Amino acid sequence: DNLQQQNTAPQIGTVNSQGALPGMVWQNRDVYLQGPIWAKIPHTDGNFHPSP
Amino acid sequence: WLPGPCYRQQRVSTTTGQNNNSNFAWTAGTKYHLNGRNSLANPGIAMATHKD
Amino acid sequence: DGVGSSSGNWHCDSTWLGDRVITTSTRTWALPTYNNHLYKQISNGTSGGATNDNTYFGYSTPWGYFDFNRFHCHFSPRDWQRLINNNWGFRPKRLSFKLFNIQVKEVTQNEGTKTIANNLTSTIQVFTDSEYQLPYVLGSAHQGCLPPFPADVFMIPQYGYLTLNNGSQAVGRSSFYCLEYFPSQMLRTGNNFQFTYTFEDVPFHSSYAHSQSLDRLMNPLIDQYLYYLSRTQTTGGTANTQTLGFSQGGPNTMANQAKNWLPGPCYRQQRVSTTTGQNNNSNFAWTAGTKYHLNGRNSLANPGIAMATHKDDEERFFPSNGILIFGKQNAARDNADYSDVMLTSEEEIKTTNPVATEEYGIVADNLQQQNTAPQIGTVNSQGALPGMVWQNRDVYLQGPIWAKIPHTDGNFHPSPLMGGFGLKHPPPQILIKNTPVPADPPTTFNQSKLNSFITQYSTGQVSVEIEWELQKENSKRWNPEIQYTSNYYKSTSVDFAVNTEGVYSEPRPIGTRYLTRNL
Amino acid sequence: AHSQSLDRLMNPLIDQYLYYLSRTQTTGGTANTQTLGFSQGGPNTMANQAKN
Amino acid sequence: DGVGSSSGNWHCDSTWLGDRVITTSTRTWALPTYNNHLYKQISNGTSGGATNDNTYFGYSTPWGYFDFNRFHCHFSPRDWQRLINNNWGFRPKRLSFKLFNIQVKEVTQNEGTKTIANNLTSTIQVFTDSEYQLPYVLGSAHQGCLPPFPADVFMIPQYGYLTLNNGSQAVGRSSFYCLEYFPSQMLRTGNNFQFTYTFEDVPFHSSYAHSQSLDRLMNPLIDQYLYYLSRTQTTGGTANTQTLGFSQGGPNTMANQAKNWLPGPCYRQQRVSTTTGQNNNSNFAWTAGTKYHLNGRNSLANPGIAMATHKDDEERFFPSNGILIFGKQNAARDNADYSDVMLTSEEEIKTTNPVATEEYGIVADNLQQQNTAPQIGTVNSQGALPGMVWQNRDVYLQGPIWAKIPHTDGNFHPSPLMGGFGLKHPPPQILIKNTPVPADPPTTFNQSKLNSFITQYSTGQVSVEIEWELQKENSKRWNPEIQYTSNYYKSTSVDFAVNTEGVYSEPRPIGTRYLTRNL
Amino acid sequence: ELQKENSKRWNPEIQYTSNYYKSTSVDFAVNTEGVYSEPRPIGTRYLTRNL
């Protein structure tokens, strides 16, 4: 959170929402016997990892 | 490597004696703001439900 | 190849071929002598009034370059009206180029009398940098393009580049580029220069506004089969306790239903109004701006990522540095008025992108218990999440066309923030120069270099032809669309035409997004 | 190593054709009020120019 | 072949092809009118202040010659850095040459007003002396080469030669060379001149420093099998008598071991220090120099044979006339300071060559007996012995390239002392001249020659391409080498680039010997 | 597999070099007891390219 010195204690900050960083890995949500199957990707200019 | 992305949400318990005594289903929800409307991020991105 | 025979013809036309359009434009240029044929070092430091954010180090060359990286150099306003009304997309395919009718003239000033006469045996030097071994200046939105109106004569800019610095001082990784270390072609009057380029594959430009929003992609008549949490406290009276209650999403609770996608990324900016009575009474253009911090410098995020300008019924608000601003005819350079600029607006993308002056959402902050009230947190800047969709910034009749993607290890969605076509091998720079001609040397030998020259300049024509590829419109909408139209009532002078003194002027910015498509 | 930086990819000699907001309050004296003023990016204000 | 069509293009590039490198350079020249189209006799005698060592006799011609006998006319500093870091040798193979874009202009001065106009029907005369029938001026390290930086315009020198003399007077074996007794080609504007040359076979240039010395070519672990004389007098006490004692060379007596080779030749010079407080307080530049006596003249041995400059930990010493000294930018002609010159150093050859400021060795002087102590003698100058090895002087980025071996009956190791490639048929001289154009002759006849001319000058381009052959590096060294590097810290301006006023400057001399090879 | 360098820079580059002055022992070589040692980390980025 800040720049520690001889007269300043170091402070921290908690991240609640974090976007994509280089080097991340993740898993998608599981499907179910009574869940949906497909969905239509909307025709736009860009998207990031188009899974429903 | 890093873990996947995060978009934090509120914790609620199935045992009713451990929750707060207020109606927080809409006021404390996790939303996203589009065009001056507050829509509910449901079910949001794929994150694990509970730890051990 | 003679003196008394021309070397080209005036081509300026546009043909429409169903799924192609081929546009040609020819202008007349003039090239002065820059820096008296010298390379010079230019720099600016923290001494004086300059600050740390505005220091530079670089060089200035005697060369001049052609720039046509702007949309109205190829399209008349009627051709732009034909383009944006009947198509859903367009991208370039190939281009051509031709210099011809070179004339080199020289000027002599004695006793305040100025005589200009032909010089039949002097040359110019033109070449293209095809192998991308130079700094790339185009795509930085500078002046000195071709004129909009074909009956104007323009002046060719100067080439100069920047390198690394530490204040007004160079470092060990600086570079010096001598442009006479490249092979170039020398042309007398009666020679011509031409080449051909082929664009790479690049996505279509979305020339449509969506007719549907992300939060309203469902059926208004059928409930869902998928529950949500709705009640946590009972409603009987004063003795309310905890409970759990669930409900289905339906037609009357459409903010609570389960959805598949997210809006695009957000990087929040400051709101300023055009009505001056509603702003704060302080100077907040630089102190309250939206910046990004690189190498201990604060640079201005301008115009930032593609976000919508204003929400509904709020046409008087705009982000402080989040739009492209175009100047009118005879607007001043510094401290122009509001009535001398043309503010664009990107309200067509508010169905998927967030508003640039509002937050992204609300996230949780703590872990609620029996003795702790739940708290919330507002997100101002949000990066990419899985499942986002967004739209790019629109292009304009007087906006840029392409930009060069920097050769790095990685990038994320390489589209230029000013709008256009992000190419990894852009059309090459074309550099031009008059060859030096010395005055009389001394009769006795002297080892120093010569610095007495004959003052010259040169002029001629130039020609550019670009072939575009279209994408037709295939909708089944019943009611009519929205089209770009001209004004119907009478006026003092015709828009998009000359004045009574002969000065051409453009009245308004013209977007592209008029037709509609579903999500 | 790159021999050039992101914030310095422009021409040191030519102004831009693209304005930015520069002034919000007048500078006459004690009775300063609100206004709007715009300017062009140039060689001396290179932190304010429009970048890609 | 017309007026309005150019006759060549600007070629300036360098290509690397594994074991070749082909370098091209193109400049722009200008040629005045010399001596008003007259041959003249020039001489200097012992009358006045001149002495016997500085007399000459010769002629001065109206012609001008092209000189490119210098290394930086072909190599950029980056190309020189690529050359000297990865190779063990290089030699030239062939060259090319091309004059084009001739422009002949004339100048008229009336009432202090100077007007310069084209002259379309005047010529120039260029030819090459391929059969070596002229005096050879190149390879004498004169000025007037091509510029280092390609964006400069230079001036062409004047041709003149020397013959035999006795004071300021000729003798019967003098020669007069009229250059219009050779066939030459006449070029108007719209003509071009070109030829091709092929170098002969010549050894590679040793671009390496040895990593081993002559006195240390043995095994540090094994004794020899070969004795030496070590003791002559006994060591018991006061009554010491004569004896003979012998020992073996080993690891601790390595100055006494038997060796196979000798160091190179020596011709001793005077030591002078750069710190002025350590020199003598007298003017000894000419009285204490190292000379050679020819025909009753004392000429200065400059820079003499290739010897090492200084031994270890003595970087402040240099021989008084044994090195090449280069001037900085804007250094004066006479009486420059120490901080306006660049002193080279040849310390890389101290593993085989002697130090230039120390003796060669110690030899005997008499025949010792029972009543005669043995004496020694110090050798200051030593010619060639059987079994010597040596190294040549290094070449530089701003040093010469070739020199012509004089056609004599014999020579010993014909390499030039200034460094480079000793060729017996060097690249030919290229002489150029403006043809005279008379003013109006009289109406009545007069037998005298004409001496009223129109004053002219001419200008154009020139192009040189030389193909070099390389020798790759094939060592098995484990630790890293020494490389030529640029400075890492910040500075006021970039080295090897232009100033803020447009003047190019070279900061330091750059050698060649950086990689290492064993003996 | 390599990728060659194709720049048109005029002034010289920055190169990795060894030390010129004298020292107690040679870097990147053995000790007097036979133990090999590396003195410094060596990067890769020395040549320059434009953006």
Short mmCIF file of N, CA and C in Angstrom, two decimals, chain B residues 4-46 51, chain C residues 215-216 228-233 240-242 244 255-259 263 311-312 350-352 358-370 372-376 382 385-386:
data_model
loop_
_atom_site.label_atom_id
_atom_site.label_comp_id
_atom_site.label_asym_id
_atom_site.label_seq_id
_atom_site.Cartn_x
_atom_site.Cartn_y
_atom_site.Cartn_z
N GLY B 4 -7.01 -18.70 -10.34
CA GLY B 4 -7.90 -18.04 -11.25
C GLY B 4 -8.46 -16.74 -10.70
N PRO B 5 -9.26 -16.06 -11.51
CA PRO B 5 -9.79 -14.75 -11.13
C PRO B 5 -10.80 -14.84 -10.00
N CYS B 6 -11.03 -13.70 -9.35
CA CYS B 6 -11.89 -13.62 -8.18
C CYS B 6 -12.80 -12.41 -8.25
N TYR B 7 -14.05 -12.60 -7.83
CA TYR B 7 -15.05 -11.53 -7.77
C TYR B 7 -15.92 -11.83 -6.55
N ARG B 8 -15.58 -11.23 -5.41
CA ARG B 8 -15.95 -11.73 -4.09
C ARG B 8 -17.45 -11.60 -3.85
N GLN B 9 -17.99 -12.52 -3.04
CA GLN B 9 -19.41 -12.53 -2.72
C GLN B 9 -19.61 -12.70 -1.22
N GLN B 10 -20.87 -12.67 -0.80
CA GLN B 10 -21.24 -12.67 0.61
C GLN B 10 -21.51 -14.09 1.09
N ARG B 11 -21.15 -14.36 2.34
CA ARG B 11 -21.28 -15.68 2.93
C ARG B 11 -22.57 -15.77 3.72
N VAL B 12 -23.35 -16.83 3.49
CA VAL B 12 -24.56 -17.08 4.25
C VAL B 12 -24.60 -18.55 4.62
N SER B 13 -25.07 -18.84 5.83
CA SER B 13 -25.07 -20.18 6.39
C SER B 13 -26.45 -20.80 6.34
N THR B 14 -26.49 -22.13 6.24
CA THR B 14 -27.77 -22.83 6.23
C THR B 14 -28.36 -22.97 7.62
N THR B 15 -27.53 -22.93 8.66
CA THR B 15 -28.03 -22.90 10.03
C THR B 15 -28.39 -21.47 10.37
N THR B 16 -29.68 -21.22 10.57
CA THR B 16 -30.20 -19.86 10.64
C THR B 16 -29.78 -19.12 11.91
N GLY B 17 -29.29 -19.82 12.92
CA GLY B 17 -28.86 -19.14 14.12
C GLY B 17 -27.53 -18.42 14.00
N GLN B 18 -26.83 -18.60 12.89
CA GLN B 18 -25.52 -18.00 12.70
C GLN B 18 -25.52 -16.85 11.72
N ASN B 19 -26.66 -16.50 11.14
CA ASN B 19 -26.74 -15.38 10.23
C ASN B 19 -27.11 -14.11 10.98
N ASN B 20 -26.97 -12.98 10.31
CA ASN B 20 -27.37 -11.71 10.89
C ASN B 20 -28.89 -11.59 10.89
N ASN B 21 -29.41 -10.77 11.79
CA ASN B 21 -30.85 -10.59 11.93
C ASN B 21 -31.30 -9.36 11.14
N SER B 22 -31.13 -9.45 9.83
CA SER B 22 -31.57 -8.39 8.93
C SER B 22 -31.78 -9.00 7.55
N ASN B 23 -32.49 -8.27 6.71
CA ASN B 23 -32.85 -8.75 5.38
C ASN B 23 -31.84 -8.19 4.39
N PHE B 24 -30.86 -9.01 4.01
CA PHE B 24 -29.73 -8.54 3.22
C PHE B 24 -29.59 -9.24 1.88
N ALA B 25 -30.69 -9.80 1.36
CA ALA B 25 -30.60 -10.55 0.11
C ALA B 25 -30.34 -9.63 -1.08
N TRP B 26 -30.93 -8.44 -1.08
CA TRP B 26 -30.73 -7.49 -2.16
C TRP B 26 -29.76 -6.38 -1.82
N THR B 27 -29.74 -5.91 -0.58
CA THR B 27 -28.87 -4.79 -0.23
C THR B 27 -27.41 -5.20 -0.12
N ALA B 28 -27.14 -6.46 0.22
CA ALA B 28 -25.77 -6.92 0.38
C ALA B 28 -25.34 -7.86 -0.73
N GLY B 29 -26.07 -7.89 -1.84
CA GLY B 29 -25.74 -8.77 -2.93
C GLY B 29 -24.55 -8.28 -3.73
N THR B 30 -24.16 -9.10 -4.70
CA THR B 30 -23.07 -8.78 -5.61
C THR B 30 -23.65 -8.42 -6.96
N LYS B 31 -23.50 -7.17 -7.37
CA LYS B 31 -24.20 -6.65 -8.53
C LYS B 31 -23.21 -6.24 -9.61
N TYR B 32 -23.76 -5.83 -10.75
CA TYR B 32 -23.00 -5.16 -11.79
C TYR B 32 -23.88 -4.08 -12.39
N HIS B 33 -23.28 -2.95 -12.71
CA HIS B 33 -24.01 -1.74 -13.05
C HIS B 33 -23.93 -1.50 -14.55
N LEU B 34 -25.07 -1.63 -15.24
CA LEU B 34 -25.14 -1.37 -16.67
C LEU B 34 -26.28 -0.41 -16.93
N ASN B 35 -25.96 0.72 -17.59
CA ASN B 35 -26.94 1.69 -18.10
C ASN B 35 -27.80 2.28 -16.99
N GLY B 36 -27.21 2.47 -15.82
CA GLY B 36 -27.98 2.96 -14.70
C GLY B 36 -28.90 1.96 -14.06
N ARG B 37 -28.78 0.68 -14.40
CA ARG B 37 -29.53 -0.38 -13.76
C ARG B 37 -28.58 -1.24 -12.93
N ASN B 38 -29.06 -1.72 -11.80
CA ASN B 38 -28.30 -2.64 -10.97
C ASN B 38 -28.84 -4.04 -11.20
N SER B 39 -28.05 -4.87 -11.87
CA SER B 39 -28.42 -6.25 -12.14
C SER B 39 -27.55 -7.17 -11.30
N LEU B 40 -28.09 -8.34 -10.99
CA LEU B 40 -27.49 -9.22 -10.00
C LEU B 40 -26.54 -10.18 -10.70
N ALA B 41 -25.30 -10.24 -10.23
CA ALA B 41 -24.30 -11.13 -10.81
C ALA B 41 -24.61 -12.55 -10.38
N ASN B 42 -25.35 -13.26 -11.20
CA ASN B 42 -25.91 -14.54 -10.81
C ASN B 42 -25.74 -15.55 -11.93
N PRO B 43 -24.97 -16.62 -11.73
CA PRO B 43 -24.21 -16.96 -10.53
C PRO B 43 -22.77 -16.48 -10.54
N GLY B 44 -22.44 -15.50 -11.37
CA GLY B 44 -21.08 -14.99 -11.37
C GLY B 44 -20.10 -15.98 -11.99
N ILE B 45 -18.82 -15.70 -11.79
CA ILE B 45 -17.77 -16.52 -12.38
C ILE B 45 -17.59 -17.79 -11.57
N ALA B 46 -16.84 -18.74 -12.11
CA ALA B 46 -16.67 -20.05 -11.50
C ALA B 46 -15.65 -19.95 -10.37
N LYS B 51 -14.45 -23.80 1.68
CA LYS B 51 -13.20 -24.47 1.96
C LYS B 51 -13.47 -25.71 2.81
N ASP C 215 -28.67 -7.28 -20.21
CA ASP C 215 -29.53 -7.63 -19.10
C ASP C 215 -30.96 -7.95 -19.53
N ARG C 216 -31.26 -7.92 -20.83
CA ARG C 216 -32.61 -8.14 -21.33
C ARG C 216 -32.58 -9.10 -22.51
N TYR C 228 -33.38 -18.42 -6.68
CA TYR C 228 -32.45 -17.46 -6.11
C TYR C 228 -32.88 -17.17 -4.69
N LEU C 229 -31.97 -16.64 -3.90
CA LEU C 229 -32.28 -16.32 -2.51
C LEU C 229 -32.95 -14.96 -2.46
N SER C 230 -34.10 -14.89 -1.80
CA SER C 230 -34.89 -13.67 -1.82
C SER C 230 -35.20 -13.11 -0.45
N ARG C 231 -35.42 -13.97 0.54
CA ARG C 231 -35.82 -13.54 1.87
C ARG C 231 -34.86 -14.11 2.90
N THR C 232 -34.49 -13.30 3.88
CA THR C 232 -33.64 -13.75 4.97
C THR C 232 -34.25 -13.50 6.34
N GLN C 233 -35.19 -12.58 6.47
CA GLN C 233 -35.82 -12.25 7.73
C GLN C 233 -37.32 -12.35 7.56
N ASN C 240 -39.28 -10.46 14.51
CA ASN C 240 -38.71 -11.06 13.31
C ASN C 240 -37.40 -11.77 13.61
N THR C 241 -37.26 -12.98 13.08
CA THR C 241 -36.08 -13.81 13.27
C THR C 241 -35.49 -14.18 11.92
N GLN C 242 -34.47 -15.02 11.94
CA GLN C 242 -33.80 -15.42 10.72
C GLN C 242 -34.56 -16.55 10.04
N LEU C 244 -34.69 -18.66 5.74
CA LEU C 244 -34.20 -18.73 4.37
C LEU C 244 -35.40 -18.91 3.47
N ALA C 255 -34.31 -8.26 -12.70
CA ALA C 255 -32.96 -7.95 -12.26
C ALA C 255 -32.35 -9.08 -11.45
N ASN C 256 -33.15 -10.07 -11.07
CA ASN C 256 -32.70 -11.15 -10.22
C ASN C 256 -32.44 -12.44 -10.98
N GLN C 257 -32.70 -12.48 -12.27
CA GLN C 257 -32.61 -13.73 -13.00
C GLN C 257 -31.16 -14.12 -13.25
N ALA C 258 -30.96 -15.39 -13.58
CA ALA C 258 -29.63 -15.91 -13.82
C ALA C 258 -29.22 -15.64 -15.26
N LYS C 259 -28.03 -15.08 -15.44
CA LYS C 259 -27.58 -14.61 -16.74
C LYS C 259 -26.23 -15.25 -17.07
N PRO C 263 -20.66 -7.48 -18.58
CA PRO C 263 -20.25 -6.35 -19.41
C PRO C 263 -18.75 -6.26 -19.54
N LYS C 311 -25.29 7.95 -19.96
CA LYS C 311 -26.49 7.13 -19.93
C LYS C 311 -27.66 7.93 -20.50
N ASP C 312 -28.88 7.44 -20.31
CA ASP C 312 -30.03 8.02 -20.97
C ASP C 312 -30.39 9.37 -20.38
N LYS C 350 -23.68 1.48 -25.20
CA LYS C 350 -24.11 1.36 -23.82
C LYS C 350 -24.92 0.10 -23.56
N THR C 351 -25.14 -0.75 -24.55
CA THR C 351 -25.81 -2.01 -24.32
C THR C 351 -24.86 -3.10 -23.84
N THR C 352 -23.57 -2.93 -24.02
CA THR C 352 -22.60 -3.92 -23.55
C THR C 352 -21.48 -3.33 -22.71
N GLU C 358 -19.28 6.11 -14.34
CA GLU C 358 -19.92 5.43 -13.23
C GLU C 358 -19.16 4.15 -12.91
N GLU C 359 -19.46 3.57 -11.75
CA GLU C 359 -18.74 2.42 -11.25
C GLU C 359 -19.12 1.17 -12.04
N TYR C 360 -18.37 0.10 -11.80
CA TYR C 360 -18.65 -1.16 -12.48
C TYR C 360 -19.68 -1.98 -11.74
N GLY C 361 -19.54 -2.11 -10.43
CA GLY C 361 -20.43 -2.96 -9.67
C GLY C 361 -20.20 -2.79 -8.19
N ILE C 362 -20.71 -3.75 -7.43
CA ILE C 362 -20.62 -3.76 -5.97
C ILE C 362 -20.21 -5.15 -5.54
N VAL C 363 -19.13 -5.25 -4.77
CA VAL C 363 -18.65 -6.53 -4.26
C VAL C 363 -18.68 -6.50 -2.74
N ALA C 364 -18.53 -7.68 -2.15
CA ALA C 364 -18.59 -7.83 -0.70
C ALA C 364 -17.29 -7.37 -0.06
N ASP C 365 -17.32 -7.25 1.27
CA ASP C 365 -16.16 -6.68 1.96
C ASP C 365 -15.76 -7.47 3.20
N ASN C 366 -16.70 -8.11 3.88
CA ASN C 366 -16.36 -8.82 5.10
C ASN C 366 -17.17 -10.11 5.19
N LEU C 367 -17.07 -10.78 6.33
CA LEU C 367 -17.75 -12.04 6.60
C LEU C 367 -18.80 -11.78 7.67
N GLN C 368 -20.07 -11.79 7.27
CA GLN C 368 -21.13 -11.44 8.19
C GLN C 368 -21.38 -12.56 9.19
N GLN C 369 -21.78 -12.18 10.39
CA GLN C 369 -22.01 -13.11 11.49
C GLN C 369 -23.28 -12.66 12.20
N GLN C 370 -23.48 -13.17 13.41
CA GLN C 370 -24.65 -12.79 14.19
C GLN C 370 -24.52 -11.38 14.75
N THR C 372 -22.32 -8.92 13.29
CA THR C 372 -21.62 -8.08 12.33
C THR C 372 -22.52 -7.82 11.14
N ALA C 373 -22.77 -6.56 10.85
CA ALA C 373 -23.57 -6.23 9.68
C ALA C 373 -22.73 -6.42 8.41
N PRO C 374 -23.34 -6.89 7.32
CA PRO C 374 -22.57 -7.06 6.09
C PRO C 374 -22.27 -5.72 5.44
N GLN C 375 -21.08 -5.62 4.86
CA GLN C 375 -20.62 -4.41 4.21
C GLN C 375 -20.36 -4.68 2.73
N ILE C 376 -20.30 -3.60 1.96
CA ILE C 376 -20.15 -3.68 0.52
C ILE C 376 -18.93 -2.86 0.10
N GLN C 382 -11.93 -2.34 -13.17
CA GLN C 382 -12.10 -3.78 -13.25
C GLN C 382 -11.44 -4.30 -14.52
N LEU C 385 -12.62 -10.37 -16.85
CA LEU C 385 -13.15 -11.58 -16.25
C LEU C 385 -13.53 -12.56 -17.35
N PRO C 386 -13.59 -13.86 -17.06
CA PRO C 386 -14.14 -14.79 -18.05
C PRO C 386 -15.62 -14.55 -18.27
#
